[PDB]
Amino acid sequence: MQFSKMHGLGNDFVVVDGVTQNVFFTPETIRRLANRHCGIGFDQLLIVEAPYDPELDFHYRIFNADGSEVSQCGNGARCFARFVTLKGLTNKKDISVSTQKGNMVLTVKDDNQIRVNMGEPIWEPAKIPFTANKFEKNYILRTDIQTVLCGAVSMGNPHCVVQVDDIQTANVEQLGPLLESHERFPERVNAGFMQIINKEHIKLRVYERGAGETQACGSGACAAVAVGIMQGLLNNNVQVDLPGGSLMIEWNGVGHPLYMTGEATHIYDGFITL
Ligand SMILES: *C[C@](N)(CCC[C@H](N)C(=O)O)C(=O)O
C-alpha cells in the first residue's frame, strides 16, 4: 500500500489513493497503523476513492485512530485537496467529493490554502444523531462530575459544543471523555470547548470521537461556529484558534453551506505491506 503523510494544523493523517490501488483493511489494522511508536502514527486515515456519482470527482472516506469509520473530517478535506492536486489525481481548482453522507467542494486557493464547502449544518436531533425530545439551542448533558450545557449539531459527524470561560482552564481532560461517549449521543460525539473572545473570534479545544484531544479539528471548528451563530453569540465570519493554529469559518445561516478555510501540508510518502 502506497500512502502519504499530511497534516492540517498538526492534526495528522495517512492519506491513501484508493483510485489506483485496491484499498481495504480491518479496524485492527487501522489501530495498529495509528500507533505512533509501532505503526505509522496518525489521528485519522483518509481514502480517496472513485466516485459513485460519476459527475463528481472523488469519494472521501475517513477512519479514526480507534478504527472507526466516519463521514466527515475538515482538516482532512483540506489535506485531501492538497493530496489529489500534488499527486496528479486532478488539477481542478474546485473539486467535488462525496462522503457517506453529503457532498462537499474543495477549492484550492492561489495562496495555497484550501476553502471547503462543508455543506449545511444539520440541527435535527435524530439526524445528528442525538437523543432529544425537541430541537433546542442548548441541551443539558449530565455527567458524573458536572452537568453541562451544549449546542448539538452535525457537519456529517456529531458535535456537542460547550461554552467555557477560559480555554486553558476548561476541564477538557475529564469532561471530554465523559461527553464523547455520553448516552444521549448513540454514535458518540466530538466534544468541543469554546471560549468566545468576541463575535468574530473564538478559541476552541476538541476532544474528538475516536481520537481524543488532537491539535486541531476542522469539523469541530465548523460546529462551534455554527452553534454560536445559532445562539446569536457569533457573527457570520469567525476566526477559530485551535492549539495548532487558526481557521476561518463563514456561514450565512440556515439554507446556506458553511465554509472553512485553512492550511494543509504534505510531509512524506510511504509504502507498507498490511
Ligand atoms: C479530521 C477531523 N479532526 C475529524 C475526524 C473525525 C472525528 N474524529 C469523528 O469521529 O467524527 C476534522 O478535522 O474535522
Please explain how this structure is put together.
The PDB classes it as isomerase. There is one protein chain. With 274 residues, the protein is α+β, with helices and mostly antiparallel strands. The protein has 2 domains: 127 residues, Diaminopimelate Epimerase, Chain A, domain 1 (Roll); 137 residues, Diaminopimelate Epimerase, Chain A, domain 1 (Roll), CATH 3.10.310.10. The protein has an 18-stranded mixed sheet that branches. β1 and β2 form a beta hairpin. The structure holds (2S,6S)-2,6-diamino-2-methylheptanedioic acid. (2S,6S)-2,6-diamino-2-methylheptanedioic acid (ZDP) binds next to β4, α2 and α4.
Largest sheet, in brief, is: 18 strands, mixed
Q: Structural class, judged by helices and strands?
A: alpha+beta
Radius of gyration: 18 Å
* Elements, N to C (H/E): EEHEEEHEEEEEEHEEEHEEEE
Q: Under CATH, the topology of the largest domain is which?
A: Diaminopimelate Epimerase, Chain A, domain 1
Number of domains: 2
Bound small-molecule species: (2S,6S)-2,6-diamino-2-methylheptanedioic acid
Please provide the count of β strands. 18
The portion of residues forming beta strands comes to 35-45%
Reading off the top of the CATH hierarchy, the class of the largest domain is best stated as Alpha Beta
Helical proportion, percent range:
10-25%
What is the helix tally? Answer: 4
Terminal residue distance: 7 Å
- The geometry reads as globular
CATH superfamily of the largest domain: Diaminopimelate Epimerase, Chain A, domain 1
Q: Give me the CATH architecture of the largest domain, please.
A: Roll
InterPro entries: DAP_epimerase_AS, DAP_epimerase_DapF
Subunit structure: Homodimer (Potential). Previously DapF has been proposed to be a monomer, however it seems that it adopts a dimeric structure.
Active site: 73 (proton donor), 217 (proton acceptor)
Family: Belongs to the diaminopimelate epimerase family.
